[PDB]
Amino acid sequence: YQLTCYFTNWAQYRPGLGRFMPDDINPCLCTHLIYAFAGMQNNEITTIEWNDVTLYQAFNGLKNKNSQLKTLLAIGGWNFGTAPFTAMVSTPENRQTFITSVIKFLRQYEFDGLDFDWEYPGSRGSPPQDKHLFTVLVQEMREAFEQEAKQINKPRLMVTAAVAAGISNIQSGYEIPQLSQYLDYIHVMTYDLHGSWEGYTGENSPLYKYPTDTGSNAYLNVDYVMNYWKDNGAPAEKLIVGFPTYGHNFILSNPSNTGIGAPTSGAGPAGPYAKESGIWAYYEICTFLKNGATQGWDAPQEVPYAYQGNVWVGYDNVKSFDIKAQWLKHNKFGGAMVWAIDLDDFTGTFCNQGKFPLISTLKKALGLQSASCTAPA
Numbered sequence: 001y002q003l004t005c006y007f008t009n010w011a012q013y014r015p016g017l018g019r020f021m022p023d024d025i026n027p028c029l030c031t032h033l034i035y036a037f038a039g040m041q042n043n044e045i046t047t048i049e050w051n052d053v054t055l056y057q058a059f060n061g062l063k064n065k066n067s068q069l070k071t072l073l074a075i076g077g078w079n080f081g082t083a084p085f086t087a088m089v090s091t092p093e094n095r096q097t098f099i100t101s102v103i104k105f106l107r108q109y110e111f112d113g114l115d116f117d118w119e120y121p122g123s124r125g126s127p128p129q130d131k132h133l134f135t136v137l138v139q140e141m142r143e144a145f146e147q148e149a150k151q152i153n154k155p156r157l158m159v160t161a162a163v164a165a166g167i168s169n170i171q172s173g174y175e176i177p178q179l180s181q182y183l184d185y186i187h188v189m190t191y192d193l194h195g196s197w198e199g200y201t202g203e204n205s206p207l208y209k210y211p212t213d214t215g216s217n218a219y220l221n222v223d224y225v226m227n228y229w230k231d232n233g234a235p236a237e238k239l240i241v242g243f244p245t246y247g248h249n250f251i252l253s254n255p256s257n258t259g260i261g262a263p264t265s266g267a268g269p270a271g272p273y274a275k276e277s278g279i280w281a282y283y284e285i286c287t288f289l290k291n292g293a294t295q296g297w298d299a300p301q302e303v304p305y306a307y308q309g310n311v312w313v314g315y316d317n318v319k320s321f322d323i324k325a326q327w328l329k330h331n332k333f334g335g336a337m338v339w340a341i342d343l344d345d346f347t348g349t350f351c352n353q354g355k356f357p358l359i360s361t362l363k364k365a366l367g368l369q370s371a372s373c374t375a376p377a
């Protein structure tokens, strides 16, 4: 199994104990590390933060401590949107310009591959033709990587993608069988499956449906999404399950109603570290629990929740990560990806469950405890 962990280049701006840099990553923890995010200018890949070059060096320098560790650069993300992707795939010339730039960039800064985080082909402004053009782009990148590997006599660069969990987004976004052929790994975003935008409490990443989930709401769980990808053409072995080291919080309309599907008035408060509206890092959630919140367990969906006064949070813990990992193994998927390494309790001081408690749970469960962690020769 792979254990693939996203690192975010804005975690550096968090105050005090929240500050997270590439050198805070245990190089033995994950099998793959993904750097979020790269940008695009004139159909060519670029940095986005002022100090990305320095951070790349520290990030890829972690491979000097683990001979087996591989790194990838993720281009795009939510705020990036679809416009530069649409423009880049719109002509063969623009795609070639991009692919050439990527090969040069990854080799220069010593990344082992590219993760496409186009959110999403065929939606959020992206026209219908981008569904097929995304397939074309990925195939062309894969084949360019194959050719480059032989010309310079080095291992081939990897091409992966973070992909939609919403069924509508999947249907308008991906030619699954064709796309799966050329991608090395498919990182399925099996989280953000519920949120305050719905007007009621719901879990961030429930494994199974809740009894009341009817119609299209029955699709908002890890099991359905992963199986949808598999049943519609993606090989299980290439499919990577998304694991969140964060939760979504809510403001309860009635503090007396604290169950799944309880009416809410909006997003819960930003945390003191990640400072994200409606989102708490796992370590921020641990503070919530320590400060007197009541623990809940969503039994049908195998995930925890917690509430105090008018604040409700749906999240993942050691128990839920374990259950999901056992499920993953039973279904013979390629492994797990984690958003994000900087949201786990990396210091171990918030949750008192050791360093990186959530990711460590996956490392143990996926048979990676005895994985090689030695500097290269």
Ligand SMILES: CCNC(=O)c1cccnc1N1CCN(C)CC1
Pocket (backbone or CB within 6 Å): 076, 077, 078, 079, 117, 119, 162, 189, 192, 279, 339
């Ligand atoms: C911060 C923006 N993140 C992304 O675009 C992203 C890219 C790849 C995988 N997961 C992503 N998240 C979507 C937003 N969620 C709140 C966390 C996970």
